């Protein structure tokens, strides 16, 4: 079993991206006999597909969870449905500002994550991280990447399971917001990469499950 | 140099109260040469007062800091102003709603907090925590307990150092909401023990100050 | 020219629906050459499919608007996207509450909002009324009336343009929430019925253009 | 009877301020034998204190009620105090930022609105408007100008009732905070204007306090 993890390079103008701290941690460690592969996505249409697309084919992982900074949100949040579109609110870091197109053309209008997203909910909860599933990842790249692993899944047989996971901004992201108006939500880093490593363990759980009954 | 903080217990149907976890454990410190007392206040007017008053009169600390959980905080926040009244919406943990009714007769319409609150701020700041002075401390119990605080400070010329501070809700406390509204901002209990160490901390250093000039 | 409009009944404990007052206001009055039927549903699984298969059915109209109530909501919002996914965090009116269910099995994940939601949004906003496209309908009775729309257009043909569209608490709404917790956004009801009044004068212009190539 | 009602230019930023259009929209009428006064501050210090102090002389109101605009508000606020500081988080209107600066040296540290409050905001409710009592009305110029009000009524015995309201944002002015990130609330110019006069009639029925035998 393979698992894969990926986080973002730092966008916005934020100076960092805990996601991509998330990645790294995450990356070449094992739960039990299962590997875990963590690579960073650069925040670029296009270049963010060719990467992703690269990386599941050179590790054809079993399980593929993205993660991503969701600005403003409160807790953990697993995101449900991924959609077949881009309307970029802000440009990508190559100053890209995609309106109103589809992300894979004739393909579906959506896909569902294959993540056992309520017993992800459910085992988190259990760790006291405070956790909610969401209905829409936004149409930027975290919601590109998450339809464009879900489309592969569909297309190829794998990964079987793919879903993707936002995570709120850690304190230290917040110290420039203070002196700049009103002061959005946060999350320990730490909670934020047991959350991640959570949602590894419980896929994995529910992939030898599925693969007996 | 004697330092008291305070915590409370459950109040409104919350399980705990991590103001309570973090006077228990900064209870028996010492910071330096400096003794620090954690004591846990009840709930209830008047209740409150009695126990205030009394702390306040055994232990004679140098510097008192109060403080509170403020539900819907998603930062660290040190009052600047405790205002001469009392009307709740919400009753306190016997039924008592009181409504429109000054603190204390005759008594100053408000105190200014006495702590050092701009530079525990920067402190705070500098140590990855986000926090910012708050110009309301509510007008229920917190706001009741920091303004006795400081009109003991002017009528019995101690503690010379008085204030509160408020901490968001632990995230443990937010598992418990999920069907309701959006989920309710939340910061780590460790960094809301430091954030009020460190106030402790920033507090016995502007006092060492004071004596010299 | 034919326009169906709808709006809900009172839900949620609410005494009363903006939504339900907006589709009686504009039943029967004309808007141009065609004509505008105002329909309220009711906010029950199964039952209100049943009333909105007859009403299209018995109408056939050539654009159906939707118009719900999304409390917390601080502007007009167009949505996007319709999920075939039924997981309400609340029951209906009768008790039900369905969770992690298709709203027709074997159909499409999604749909596209058919109506011109970019121009609609542009014209709100030289109204002077605040507006922003969402990419979730939730997963409740709102999102299930605008899936089934969308899915009857795409099995019926018929109507060419389906949306829906969530309008704020009305101000009157807002008067026993401001007791208890915090207090929501609203917007009075002229202006949500604006809106709507606005949204159905875009699709009907967008309806020539398409008839007239 | 003499009433005095005053709001503030564009602050910065803004293109507009409802207050503005408020205090002119009154200017001039009359409620019963009360004739009311509609008078429009600079936001600048000192030039606002300037202004404050020619206008109350000129005219000396039995009833002073200063309406300022406060972003993010949900519903109309009534100010219960106003505090002798001067905090700045942003430059005012002429180029000068002031921090922890007392308004009148000596002063009191805080002076309570004179307004009933109370029936002010129950006769909202009962017209439909959403409002609640609030405990800081920042240390900026709105609370600058209630308290110098608050001040000179003490000193100077007039005006005998004054106080302060702050509105939300008007819905003209949020279609530009849409295309930044989280749309900001807002109330119709109609209500807001509604709002402040019935705190004024509240404020005159109130002055009935001079009924005998």
Redesign the interface.
């Known amino acids: 079993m393979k698992v894969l993890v990926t986080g973002f390079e730092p966008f916005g103008g934020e100076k960092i991206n805990p996601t991509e701290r998330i990645a790294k941690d995450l990356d070449g460690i094992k739960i039990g006999d299962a590997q875990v592969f963590g690579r960073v996505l650069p925040v670029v249409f296009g270049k963010a597909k060719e990467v992703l697309e690269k990386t599941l084919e050179e590790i054809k992982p079993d399980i593929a969870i993205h993660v991503g900074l969701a600005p ?1 949100r ?2 953990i949040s697993i995101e ?2 991924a ?1 077949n ?1 881009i ?1 970029a609110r802000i440009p990508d870091n190559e100053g890209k500002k995609i309106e ?1 197109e589809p992300i894979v053309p004739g393909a ?5 994550s294959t993540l056992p997203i ?1 017993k992800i909910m459910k085992k988190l ?1 259990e760790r ?3 956790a ?2 969401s ?2 990842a ?2 930027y790249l975290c919601n590109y990447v998450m339809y464009l692993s879900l489309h592969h899944s569909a297309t190829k047989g794998y990964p079987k399971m793919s879903g993707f996971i936002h995570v709120p901004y850690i ?2 992201q ?2 420039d ?2 002196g700049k ?8 880093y ?2 934020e990469l047991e959350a991640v490593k959570v949602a590894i363990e419980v896929a994995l759980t529910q992939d030898m499950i599925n693969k007996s009954t």
Chains 1, 2, 3, 4 share one sequence.
């Open positions: 403003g409160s807790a449900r449905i959609v579109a309307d109103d579906p209008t959506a896909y569902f309520k909860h006291g991280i405070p909610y599933i209905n829409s936004g149409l304190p230290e917040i110290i917001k203070i108006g009103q002061v959005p939500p946060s999350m320990c730490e909670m």
